[model samples]
Target: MTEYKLVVVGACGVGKSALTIQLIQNHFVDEYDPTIEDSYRKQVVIDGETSLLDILDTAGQEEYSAMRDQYMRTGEGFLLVFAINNTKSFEDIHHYREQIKRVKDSEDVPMVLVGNKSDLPSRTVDTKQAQDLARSYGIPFIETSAKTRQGVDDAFYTLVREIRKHKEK
Candidate 1:
């Protein structure tokens, strides 16, 4: 099995856990459950081969500057998630990108900008805005809904493809 690990970061209650759950377990969580710091694994077959996508939910208010370096250091790629329904979450995604760059110190690090909670009716941040941000940074963008299980797995697959493409180059 091939290993493709990605680190996830987002504001509190931005459907981070739900997106992760939906991608791995194929089940969406109706209730918000704050997951204790942990890692998740999913095996997906791509190009007629199995790929292992490991994820870590590490968005919290803990002061772990030193710990954070090592935390994000070993990651092959990242999924910077934000809720489309919340404008604040969307704006806060900029910080997540800056933070990742600081920790990894790599200007060309592989990453995907994700706008989750696409199933919500009243979305404050439009999909075009998300696309603009991604275009500015030259990274891929995706909108997903964990509830409807829409585009959740596609986000993961896109990130893995981005990582592999960068790795080869």
Candidate 2:
């Protein structure tokens, strides 16, 4: 409850890096990036509750096994993300979900599924396309702009809520 370890995982162009920048103040971690593995932090205050985030920024990529093994083993929650323009990015998420299960050895990981890159003029995925998957998983879905930073704020808050929900148990 006091501090939350938030593993931000997503496929290519999914704003895995952008969302991290939006969440924290530079002064809080006193310019936190240099400590990435040991790590950079973020925070979101939802309905008056404050929670800190430990962002696994380059995580969920299979090659970073040393880092992935360490992170997935201890991660408490996740901010699952995808891209709207390349709807196939949506399919990659199931693989990511399965990896989490293999690493954590549990099907009960708490997470928010986000569809990013909405600033594109032409998109392959509609809003419902994202929502349907979210509904099936019983998690919240949000379409946000990693580049424009529009709906990402809402995305972060919802993610914070999901992460908090898992923490309470």
Candidate 3:
């Protein structure tokens, strides 16, 4: 069995845990409190290959900034998340990418940039911005909504696919 540590990160209230919950457990929480601090680990099978997914759903508060380096150091891949309705969250990707590179010392790590809350129509960050940001970091990007389960599977499967491709090479 192959094991991969995947980290999901973003600013507070950006739906990092929601995306993970939807993908791993297939459930969604409608009324969420941002004060909760939690994380989980799970094993998933893709294309008959088993991989352990250790997810770090860290808090978005400034206090957690110090631990970001440690999380990035251990993760083989990352799911960088932002809320579509929050433009500042989207802008924070630059910092997130930089932190990942600083810890990993390599830009080759597979990353899937996710814009959550796609089910809402009042989005401030446009798709073009998401695509451009992902392109700049050489990562795949997709918008998702845990509420409707839209693009939730694709967000995770895309990361798995990229990891499998890298392994093949």
* Number of the predicted model whose lDDT against the real structure is largest: 1
Clashes (candidate 1): 0
- Candidate 1 vs candidate 3: the TM-score winner is 1
Superposed model 3: Cα runs more than 4 Å off: 32-35, 63-68
Per-candidate clashes, comma-separated: 0, 0, 0
| Model 1, C-alpha of 152: deviation from truth (Å) | 0.7
Minimum summed lDDT over a 10-residue window in model 1 is located at: 59-68
Residue 50 CA displacement from its true place in model 2, Å: 2.9
**Per-residue lDDT for 1-169 in model 3, tens only?**
6777777878888888788778778899875567665667778787777777677776646543556567558877778899999989988988888777888898787789999999888989999988998888877998899887899878877887877777687
| Per-model TM values vs. the true structure | 0.94, 0.81, 0.88
lDDT of each: 0.84, 0.71, 0.80
The candidate scoring highest on TM-score is 1
Q: Write the per-residue lDDT of candidate 1 for residues 1-169, one digit (tens) a residue.
A: 6998888888888888888888878898877556566679888897676988889877556555787678777788888899988999888888888877888888888889988888889889988999999999899998888899998878888889899888899
What lDDT, from 0 to 1, does candidate 3 have? 0.80
The regions of model 1 sitting more than 4 angstroms off are none
Tens-digit lDDT track of model 2 for 1-169? 5676667777756667666775553211224343243346756566887767666665432564666677676777777888888777888988877777788888778778888878888788888878888888888887777667767778767766776677677
What TM-score would you give candidate 2 relative to the actual structure? 0.81
Task: Tell how far residue 143 is off in model 3, in angstroms.
Answer: 1.4
